[PDB]
Design a binder for this molecule. Structure first.
Ligand SMILES: [Cu+2]
Ligand SMILES: [Cu+2]
Ligand SMILES: [Cu+2]
Ligand SMILES: [Cu+2]
Ligand SMILES: [Zn+2]
Ligand SMILES: [Zn+2]
Ligand SMILES: [Zn+2]
Ligand SMILES: [Zn+2]
Ligand SMILES: [Zn+2]
Ligand SMILES: [Zn+2]
Ligand SMILES: [Zn+2]
Ligand SMILES: [Zn+2]
Ligand SMILES: [Zn+2]
Ligand SMILES: [Zn+2]
Ligand SMILES: [Zn+2]
Ligand SMILES: [Zn+2]
Ligand SMILES: [Zn+2]
Ligand SMILES: [Zn+2]
Lengths: 77, 460, 460, 77
């Protein structure tokens, strides 16, 4: 189970990372002009837990369990 | 060891010595500075037609992709920096290649989607791969991502074919043939000709610097292999580091007008004499054809331009230019075109007129002198002084005359004398002036009385 | 079946349709028929310099091997009949090839010794093989078998670079650059320029027609393979069927002289004005150099020629030309070069003199008329009649005068009258003649008595 | 045991023929402007038997037992 995972908001995350055992899902988020690509827990793919942890006020997000599924064009700016 | 082989090849490329920025130099005509002067008269003007040697030096890194070399240009192609390149008909080095990574900069291709890898790169496979990616982009992102064109514009006043080859590449005498450049018209100076090149780029395919020169060849290519095939200091290797895709066209402008801002006019419509019929040679665009369009009219060209200001996103765009880099240090390769050519320069000296008007209540005397440029029987230039046959004659109750000079007259001198009625000084110089330019129309008018004569020298 | 694959490929080549004898056509300048006339006078002659459009059509099957394409020409090489070929920078079709048989026609190679077979033909291997054979011949038969040269000679009066490209190939603007063609000199007509190409052939390497088109490709090359690589009716395939080895050179001839048989002079020394300094660009010969030699002198060129009239037989000779054949029907491929160019033609009209001599014992009257070609202020041509100011005046105890006319005079008319002493007919026409050409020197002399006057009109 | 064998005088015999059992040698002959390449008996590699059988009056000849040894440049015109 591998996801595009980057430590900071990148406008183009190319790093394919094997997620650990804590995470079981791929998250991608668009919040303003920024993009996020992270390994994520499916239990926390909700607006309240995503906004607060990423310290963002408004966003759209997408969670999936397929390999390398959290790519930027899953959302539409 | 498979790593000593890498060092041998890398050592061989790095061991080549060449002038990195003079090895690619095209030399057109070399000419002695022979001059020439034709001169003649026609209604209203004295025309002088002067021929002089002139040089042009143009440097360029973006070479053109024509139908003659499209089968040969592709991201990552290995070429010899030799005469073939200067001619824009480069040569593929016939040798196995290494895996090539290409990046296409179309909008919406994020993460890794913008990157290809071809393990046996050739013109067939790399194109098939680049097209697959562009088409995949058309199918997934073209309807929510617009692709405007990046315009690159260049223009020049046409003087000679060798002059145009230096500006647009030796390639040009073939590509720009459908323009049918009226070169008979320029040596007589009856109209001006401007060739402009328009390049509208929608996207590029590029290659990043490989880790080492050996990465561009097969794992088994040896310094001997390159030495056998003529790859050395005379003709070092380059690789296509970038290909620009889009639409390109050449446009001709035949202007009867004699204006000067003719170019600034052309340069300004690309966003004032709407004379000049236009001739366009479009290279690319929709397959449904229209390779050549003509004539103008005015801004059907302007319509032709905007027609390709956005990527229609129906098919992959056509290759229109490429850039090469030296394998040695991955620096961009610049081609330098130099040539001597004969620039024809027409100069018109407009005719002029001098009017003498006497309305004073006194007798007047006019004196008119001037210089005259001419030729003798052998055709050699001559400068001579002249005099009006009317000089010195008594004039006028309502006397008036107009002297019409051809353009080859200059430095007019004028004197005006009037009768005073004084026995001790019968004539007095009312007015005199030298070095008078030949303006279209000049009046020397005198009026008044004997005791208080008046005059005016007026340019109408 | 491995024999159905053969038919597929043979069917594809034979299925191509193209104008077998117009597909290879180079088109230089296309020009409108714009004319021009300069005219002026100088000591002894009235020179007229006329410019006129002219065309040249040259067909050729023997193309030149330069340093720009030597890495690419070899017996059996597969080339695309396309723009690259017309430019003499052909393109190797990148595809596996079949086994190629080559025959070298050096004397003494009998039975089978004159034949090679290369299983993976390339520029490296075929050359290495051809050289091995030539060297093996040098070691075994050169000292008892002489090899004279087969001379091929071509020459032309230089007028324009595009004119010379048509005569010698688009290649020429690069190969013939060290000649530094004085093109400024020809538009003034102060001297003539002739470029000649000498090709001394010592031996050839040739390829016989393969059994079928499929034999030229790898056993596994497919019609698709050729379609993917652009081999089709637009650009059908050719193969190098013959390479000539030896020595070649270009020679320039700058002649101040105005003679006509200048070329017949040049054409005759190759086995009469020894004016003109010479400039040679030798292509091949001994490695010890002498790429350019100049100037003349007289027949150090003649020495330069004979120096390579026999194969020195120290090393394999240099490739200097090649011939291609269509893969479809193995017929020789002819390239056709056409171009329009401006031919400058100088015409000199020599001055002349007319002498009148009166030595008769009677009073005489001379009348001289002539026509005169000239221009007006606008430069337009004019023809006008003229008269000698001495017409009609009584002449002579020992009267003589010489009339000196510029070359622009023509159609002289002369009359001579003498006093008779008869009251009813005082003057009689001794002589009269019209339409007299302007010869260098003509005498009208009269002598004798009143009753028996004499005259003579004599061209000196 | 193969020799260049041609049925008639050729100025360039390229045919490599396996000689039969009657012949055990390769003959080549230059007689005037003509050349001969034949399978031959070694017992008959003498001037008298060669001239008469080939109906030639003057000639030089060469006989050898090595394969493809009767090539034209064995003699010198
Ligand atoms: Cu480019
Ligand atoms: Cu004008
Ligand atoms: Cu040839
Ligand atoms: Cu002359
Ligand atoms: Zn969490
Ligand atoms: Zn002048
Ligand atoms: Zn006029
Ligand atoms: Zn005027
Ligand atoms: Zn997007
Ligand atoms: Zn060139
Ligand atoms: Zn009045
Ligand atoms: Zn004239
Ligand atoms: Zn003169
Ligand atoms: Zn004279
Ligand atoms: Zn011999
Ligand atoms: Zn050309
Ligand atoms: Zn006397
Ligand atoms: Zn016998």
């Amino acid at each position: 189970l591998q996801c595009y995972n980057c430590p900071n908001p990148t406008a183009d995350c190319k790093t394919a990372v094997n997620c650990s055992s804590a995470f079981d899902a791929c998250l991608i988020t668009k919040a303003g002009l920024q993009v996020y690509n992270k390994c994520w827990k499916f239990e926390h793919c909700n607006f309240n837990d995503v906004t607060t942890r990423l310290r963002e006020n408004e966003l759209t997000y997408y969670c999936c369990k397929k390999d390398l599924c959290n790519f930027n064009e899953q959302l539409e700016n | 060891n498979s790593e000593a082989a890498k060092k041998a090849l890398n050592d061989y490329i790095w061991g080549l010595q060449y002038d990195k920025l003079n090895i690619l130099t095209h030399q057109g005509e070399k000419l002695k500075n022979h001059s020439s002067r034709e001169a003649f008269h026609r209604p209203g003007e004295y025309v002088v037609i002067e021929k002089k040697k002139q040089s042009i030096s143009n440097a360029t890194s973006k070479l053109s992709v024509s139908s003659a070399n499209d089968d040969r240009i592709f991201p990552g192609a290995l070429l010899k920096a030799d005469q073939s390149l200067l001619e824009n008909l480069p040569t593929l080095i016939p040798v196995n290649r290494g895996k090539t990574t290409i990046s296409v900069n179309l909008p919406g291709l994020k993460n890794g989607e913008s990157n290809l890898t071809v393990e046996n790169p050739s013109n067939s496979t790399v194109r098939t791969a680049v097209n697959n990616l562009v088409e995949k982009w058309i199918q997934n992102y073209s309807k929510t991502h617009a692709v405007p064109a990046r315009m690159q514009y260049e223009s020049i006043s046409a003087q000679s074919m060798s002059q145009l080859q230096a500006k647009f590449g030796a390639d040009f005498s073939k590509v720009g043939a459908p323009l049918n450049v009226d070169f008979s018209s320029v040596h007589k100076g009856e109209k001006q000709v401007f060739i402009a090149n328009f390049r509208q780029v929608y996207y590029t395919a590029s290659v990043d610097s490989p880790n080492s020169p050996s990465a561009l060849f097969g794992s088994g290519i040896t310094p001997t292999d390159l030495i056998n095939r003529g790859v050395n200091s005379k003709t070092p290797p380059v690789y296509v580091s970038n290909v620009s895709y889009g639409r390109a066209m050449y446009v001709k402008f035949e202007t009867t007008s004699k204006s000067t801002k003719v170019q600034a006019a052309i340069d300004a419509v690309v966003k004032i004499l709407k004379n000049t019929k236009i001739c366009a040679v479009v290279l690319g665009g929709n397959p449904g054809e229209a390779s050549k369009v003509c004539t103008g009219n005015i801004d059907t060209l302007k319509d032709l331009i905007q027609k390709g200001s956005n990527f229609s996103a129906q098919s992959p765009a056509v290759p229109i230019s490429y850039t090469t880099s030296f394998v040695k240090d991955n620096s961009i390769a610049t081609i330098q075109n130099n040539t001597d050519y004969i620039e024809t320069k027409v100069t018109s000296y407009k005719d002029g007129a001098l009017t003498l008007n006497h309305d004073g209540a006194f007798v007047a005397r006019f004196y008119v002198y001037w210089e005259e440029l001419g030729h003798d029987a052998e055709g050699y230039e001559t400068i001579r002084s002249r005099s009006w046959s009317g000089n010195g004659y008594n004039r006028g109750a309502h006397y008036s005359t107009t002297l019409r000079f051809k353009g080859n007259v200059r430095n007019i001198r004028v004197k005006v004398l009037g009768a005073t009625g004084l026995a001790w000084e019968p004539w007095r110089l009312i007015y005199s002036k030298n070095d008078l330019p030949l303006v279209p129309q000049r009046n020397i008018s005198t009026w008044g009385t004997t005791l208080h004569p008046q005059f005016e020298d007026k340019v109408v």
